[PDB]
Amino acid sequence: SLPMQHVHTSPVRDYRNRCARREGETVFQVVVEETDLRVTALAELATPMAAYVGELRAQLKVWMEFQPAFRHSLVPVEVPEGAPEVVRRMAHGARLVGVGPFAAVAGTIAQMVAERFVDVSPELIVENGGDLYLYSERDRVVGILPDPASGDMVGILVRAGTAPVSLCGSSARIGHSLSLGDGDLAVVRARDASLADAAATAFGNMLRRADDVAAVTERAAQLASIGIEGVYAQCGGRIGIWGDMELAV
Numbered sequence: 001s002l003p004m005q006h007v008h009t010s011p012v013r014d015y016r017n018r019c020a021r022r023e024g025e026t027v028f029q030v031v032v033e034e035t036d037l038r039v040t041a042l043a044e045l046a047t048p049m050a051a052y053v054g055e056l057r058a059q060l061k062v063w064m065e066f067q068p069a070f071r072h073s074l075v076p077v078e079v080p081e082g083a084p085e086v087v088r089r090m091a092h093g094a095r096l097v098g099v100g101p102f103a104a105v106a107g108t109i110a111q112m113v114a115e116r117f118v119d120v121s122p123e124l125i126v127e128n129g130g131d132l133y134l135y136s137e138r139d140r141v142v143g144i145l146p147d148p149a150s151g152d153m154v155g156i157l158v159r160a161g162t163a164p165v166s167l168c169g170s171s172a173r174i175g176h177s178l179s180l181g182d183g184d185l186a187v188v189r190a191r192d193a194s195l196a197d198a199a200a201t202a203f204g205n206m207l208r209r210a211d212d213v214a215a216v217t218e219r220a221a222q223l224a225s226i227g228i229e230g231v232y233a234q235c236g237g238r239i240g241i242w243g244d245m246e247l248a249v
Ligand code: NA
Pocket: 001, 002, 003, 004, 005, 127, 128, 129, 130, 131, 172
């Protein structure tokens, strides 16, 4: 789904120094209730991946029973050391940009699923709605939005060697207004998907009019020291880009 879909290219860089074993990439869907993943891997992992997602989901359900204000908080929430990993990572990402833990759920799940299986699939792309986690040794292009006029896809380049990384977008579907120029969208790049996902929410919230685009790229630049690597912001015909954001068309 757009935004954040792997788009197939032949790479200019491909630091896999062997390419025996695995050039064959498989693509499958992991669906567990309302968590819906699209995965590109070197092995067939749908089954163990659904079991793992099921488990992360159970932990959140249990944590929500214990901390009733967690699910709908619009502000940072304190969590103890004994809390589940998924809960702690979302809470931390949300606290860095001053939003609620659930603003980081989808990014957190994509990165954790990816971390759990990268050992058996060193090429691995986990797409969770508008959030995407990538491990890779070649150039990869992550599609953001189509250009209706051009007739084709606009994406962000993740150069070989720079993954693992998150690309997290402020909207999950398109959209209905969502295309190049048209419709509000923030996309955030960071190693920590909890931060990228919470930031995409914070930046999304701040995009109300054209003039807000500059407030987002400026704010993203302020957040470089806590992990923010780049931002793409679109609103009201204005497009602003900060940091490590090279577009491929
Ligand atoms: Na997507």
